[PDB]
Design a protein around this nucleic acid. Sequence first.
RNA 1: CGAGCUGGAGAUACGCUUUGACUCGGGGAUGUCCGAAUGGGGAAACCCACCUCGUAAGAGGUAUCCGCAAGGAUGGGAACUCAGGGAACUGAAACAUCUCAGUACCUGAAGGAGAAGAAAGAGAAUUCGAUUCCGUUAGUAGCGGCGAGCGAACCCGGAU
RNA 2: GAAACGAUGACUGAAUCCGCGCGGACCACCGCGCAAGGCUAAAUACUCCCAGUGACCGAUAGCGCAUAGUACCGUGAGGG
RNA 3: CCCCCGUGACAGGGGGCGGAGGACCGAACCGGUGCCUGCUGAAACAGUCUCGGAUGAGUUGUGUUUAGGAGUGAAAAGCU
RNA 4: AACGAUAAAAGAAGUGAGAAUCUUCUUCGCCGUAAGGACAAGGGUUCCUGGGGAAGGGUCGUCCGCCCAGGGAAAGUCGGGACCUAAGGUGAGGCCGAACGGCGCAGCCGAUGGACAGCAGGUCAAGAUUCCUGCACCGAUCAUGUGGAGUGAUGGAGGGACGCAUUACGCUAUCCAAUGCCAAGCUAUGGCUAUGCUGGUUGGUACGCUCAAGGGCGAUCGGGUCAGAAAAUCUACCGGUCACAUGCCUCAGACGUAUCGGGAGCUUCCUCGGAAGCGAAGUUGGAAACGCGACGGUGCCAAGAAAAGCUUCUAAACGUUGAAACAUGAUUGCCCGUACCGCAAACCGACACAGGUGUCCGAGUGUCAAUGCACUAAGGCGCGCGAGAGAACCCUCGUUAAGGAACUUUGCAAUCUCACCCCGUAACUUCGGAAGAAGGGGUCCCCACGCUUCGCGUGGGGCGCAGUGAAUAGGCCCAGGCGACUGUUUACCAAAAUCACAGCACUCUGCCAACACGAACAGUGGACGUAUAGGGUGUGACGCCUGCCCGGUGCCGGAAGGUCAAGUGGAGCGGUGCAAGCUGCGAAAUGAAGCCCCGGUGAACGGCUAAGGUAGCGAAAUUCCUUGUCGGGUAAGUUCCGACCUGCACGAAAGGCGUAACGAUCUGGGCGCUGUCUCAACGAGGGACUCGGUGAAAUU
RNA 5: UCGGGUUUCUAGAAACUUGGAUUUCUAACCUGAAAAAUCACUUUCGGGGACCGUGCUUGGCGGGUAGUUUGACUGGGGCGGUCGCC
Length: 218
Amino acid sequence: ALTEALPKTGGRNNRGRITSRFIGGGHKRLYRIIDFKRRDKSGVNAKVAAIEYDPNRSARIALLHYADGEKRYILAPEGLTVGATVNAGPEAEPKLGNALPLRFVPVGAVVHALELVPGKGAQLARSAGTSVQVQGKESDYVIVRLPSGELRRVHSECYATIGAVGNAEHKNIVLGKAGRSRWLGRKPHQRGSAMNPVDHPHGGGEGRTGAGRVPVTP
RNA sequence: CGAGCUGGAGAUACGCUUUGACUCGGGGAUGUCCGAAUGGGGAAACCCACCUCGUAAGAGGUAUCCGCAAGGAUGGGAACUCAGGGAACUGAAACAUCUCAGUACCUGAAGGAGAAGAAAGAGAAUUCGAUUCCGUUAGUAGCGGCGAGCGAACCCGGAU
RNA sequence: GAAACGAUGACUGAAUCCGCGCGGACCACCGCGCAAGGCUAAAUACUCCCAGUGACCGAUAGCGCAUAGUACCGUGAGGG
RNA sequence: CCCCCGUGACAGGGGGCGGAGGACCGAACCGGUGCCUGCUGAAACAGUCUCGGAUGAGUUGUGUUUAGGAGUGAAAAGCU
RNA sequence: AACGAUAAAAGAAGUGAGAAUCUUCUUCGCCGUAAGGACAAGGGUUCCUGGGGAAGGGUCGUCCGCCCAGGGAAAGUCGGGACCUAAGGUGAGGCCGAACGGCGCAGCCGAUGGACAGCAGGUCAAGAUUCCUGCACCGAUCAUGUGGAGUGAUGGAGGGACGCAUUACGCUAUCCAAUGCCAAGCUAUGGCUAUGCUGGUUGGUACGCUCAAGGGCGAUCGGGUCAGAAAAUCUACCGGUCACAUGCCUCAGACGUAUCGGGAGCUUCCUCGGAAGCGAAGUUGGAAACGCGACGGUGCCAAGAAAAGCUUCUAAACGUUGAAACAUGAUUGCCCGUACCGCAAACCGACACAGGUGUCCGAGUGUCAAUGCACUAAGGCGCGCGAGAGAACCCUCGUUAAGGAACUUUGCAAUCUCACCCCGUAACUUCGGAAGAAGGGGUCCCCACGCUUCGCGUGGGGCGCAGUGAAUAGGCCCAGGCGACUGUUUACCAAAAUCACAGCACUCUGCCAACACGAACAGUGGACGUAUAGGGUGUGACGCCUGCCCGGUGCCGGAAGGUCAAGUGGAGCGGUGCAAGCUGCGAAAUGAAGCCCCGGUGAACGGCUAAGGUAGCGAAAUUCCUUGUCGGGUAAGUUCCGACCUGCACGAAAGGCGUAACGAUCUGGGCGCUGUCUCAACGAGGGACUCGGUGAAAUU
RNA sequence: UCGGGUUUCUAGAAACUUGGAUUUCUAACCUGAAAAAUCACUUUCGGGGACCGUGCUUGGCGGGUAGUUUGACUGGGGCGGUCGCC
Ligand SMILES: [Mg+2]
Ligand SMILES: [Mg+2]
Ligand SMILES: [Mg+2]
Ligand SMILES: [Mg+2]
Ligand SMILES: [Mg+2]
Ligand SMILES: [Mg+2]
Ligand SMILES: [Mg+2]
Ligand SMILES: [Mg+2]
Ligand SMILES: [Mg+2]
Ligand SMILES: [Mg+2]
Ligand SMILES: [Mg+2]
């Protein structure tokens, strides 16, 4: 049904020319307003109304209704149901995703929608079904395993939502025929090999080759 | 001024003049609309509003920057002037230094001219005496892949 | 370059009175002048503009124009 | 999604029904394959016959944005 | 030479100095999803009327889109603006910048989107939802009366906000049929006399217990503060009570009544021809939208403007005796565009140019269907030199004896094929395809009968050489290379074996990310994305796969030691002076990133001494000798296929070997059928030749 | 804590110091949530914080770009040979 969002708009560059190569497809995707802080709410439950799939992301977002009679979208994690509910704030018991900080949080307690700076909403493991693993508590900072396979410090003043996401993992997704791309991306990359001395470093020759392996520009 | 005038254009018709026209000189009053343009909008000259006065018709104000305020300023001028920024072909019989050149052009500020100006100096006589210009000194002194080539100043005579 | 002085960007950063600057490395003696305040006629430049003059042209010359930046080309800047 | 059959693990196959698809043929439309014609042309790139795409990575309008060593480019140094 | 498309004319009459060409009439031909008609863009008066004939019009010209004067265009409701916002453009304060200047929230500007009140006809030579007529609707301001109480923000919320594909039912436009109905008269050539033939056969408004699909529907009390900044008698959320159906609300539209138009044609005059006035009928059945009922049904994923208008809630605020509202009249009604051309002699193309140009309407017959093909209505038009001749030669056509690819570089070219229906249909395979494989048969008319008819099937007869009897309308096959595939490219010599592609892999980036644009600790794109995400490179479905060498280059790491800048800092030497001092040069030490150096990585550069080619393929689009040798097909085969292998100079992601399917791809072969050829003939049309009119060019 | 210097009270003790590092803290500086979008402020504030970054200078890397260079003889040009002296 989708609802109460905004309108996006294709565009691949500013104050002039093409910056990030390619991309221009589209299909008028609107933007739904989310929430990655989940704090001015701290204290009330809400009925996960539904899990409306929404573009831009790839994370079956979830619809919530916090008692006040207000509305909000949430990165439906990995397992909430047709109307399961949830509260929020330190007085939160690490259940199916919650608006809880970090110290009060268990070890190796996979979560997500995590954060990088007190408030300033999420900013980590918010995609596909990325699972941020926790580890050691420290002074105030913690020890975490970001999807990357990295160990970064961060402190508890930075909320997070229980467990990982999923969106089933873009798996059986194979795209298919060129164009499933155009279904979004664009002019799928041009090989600087089949280009010209003129346009790219790899260019020239008379058959095929390599020599140096550099990127566009140098 | 003194007897024509009724714009080039010359064409028909009506007409104005010594009760002084016309032309000429010199101040006024009218002057829409656009354009710095400023009420607001805008594809220049077109659309649209508000306040104040007002019989209607109609009249004035409504940009911004400085400044209590009075008052000043935004734009425009052919070349000339000072500043900010600053090429290359070209020459070196090839080329990077150098040359062309601080030339071309851009930009800014102002004027009728500017800029520069009252020696913390020139310069060797214990001399001179603000700055600008011309003559000459001098193609010297000196700079220079010491190549190509570039090149002052005091002194002295004048403009003032 | 032995290279003074002026100049300014970054750093530092003195004296005020037998004080200070300079006189082309640097020191002495010698001499010259006094900075971190301002102002300033005149001669000099140019020529859109006016007058006068010319061993200047006199209509393929002279200004592009005996007038037109018009006609005409160009999306245009521009040319003409 | 509805039924039929089955039998060794088998899948499966059958009648219903539904309406998928850089699917099929073809006009518009969009291309431009081969031949001939044209070559001081009807035309500074075309005509006839012939041919490809045709719900798509489709075709197109208005508005607007991107530019010179720069843009743009399903990439020829192509177009600007 | 040419006179701008091979859509053809012909006569009569007229005008006039003068006519192949101007007007008129009557024949003819051409177009008819257009060569008809309506906007928009764009042009400007080309429009109309009266004149003209120099130049412009490829000849003429009495004519013109040309020359001249005059006229011609009319809106409260159509478009736009006085309303709205999108990309983008701007922009008080604010962020950056040698200058000029680049940014940038709000706000403002900005359609091609939203939003909003008129419909039927009439008519100047030339305009019409704009003028007239007929009735209507909209805001506004006013009065009259009803009402008798609130009204209700730059503010809240609701709402306006919308994708693609497919599709059920109702219908309207629109079209068709008929011994429906009205109108008019004639018919003869042999027949018919009317059951023939021709034309017309309704729109606006208003009322109607008529018919009616389809479409739209919760309400209300109360509660919870933590939500709408605030308030809220609204919204959001929570909970109790009655809602299958119905129940409502609503009608697309049909019918009837009435009224207003219009309506085949009819009457008189006509200054020569328009003008004026009159008026019949309105049937039954069938077809039928890409439009209307609408914000319908369903499925799908690649997930679908914003704002105001608008309903509602209140803060403020006014008054609660003359409100909000309703009705009835009264008054009001701004600016710009409104002619004509408009797929085209009136726009872009130097030209009255065979080109280009967005959207809408776009009839009938026949043909499964259609916006196709043939004819044709309406409507438009016969392309602005013309007339003879009937040679060569050239262009575009029709036929062709015997032969049938012998042509040739090659079957290039042109024939054959060609539609629907029934039968039938292989190798191979990713099981979907290959498949319209191949091959074969049928198709016309009539009568009867059976079927659901427009029509089809069963059967009997019929005519022709011939029955999609006209027009549209796949020739097929085997074998191989190259790329898997739809796609894309060299506007004006290359469409392909290019580019792209799904998929694979390397690699880098934790967020002010890498990366990129930029004068700029400005702004911004990546992304309102956060690692199953973003960049760069290379490889190119799927299949089995991906070998050996880190010496040299590049990268990541290690990281003792060697080397190395500025600077800190020290000996030391030296110049001048009487001295303090002032002063030239200065050195060991200490001082980074890298560089040396140690180690590693090949879907890194890359080689096959750092090492030597696993699988696989091999004379290959990479072979030189070479027409390799033998086998295949031919009578005969430099090329093609098969194998072998002595791989000049095959090789595993510049990927290797394969691969159903696909290809305006290239190579070889076969069947068919041909004028490609033996070898050309005849015939047509358009030039060429002749005469009259106008009259180039390169060149010299 | 490591560097040393200065001054005093006895190499130590004390103090004044002036440096490197580690760490730590934080008014500058930075940056994020809120009623008032970019910005200024109020503060919860939150966290970063002497780093980054901006300015001057140092040396490295730098076909990303720029300016350029790349001889002559030559029975044609390149390849080969050659170009001075006896
Ligand atoms: Mg003369
Ligand atoms: Mg002139
Ligand atoms: Mg066809
Ligand atoms: Mg903005
Ligand atoms: Mg003829
Ligand atoms: Mg004869
Ligand atoms: Mg075909
Ligand atoms: Mg291909
Ligand atoms: Mg293709
Ligand atoms: Mg270079
Ligand atoms: Mg060489």
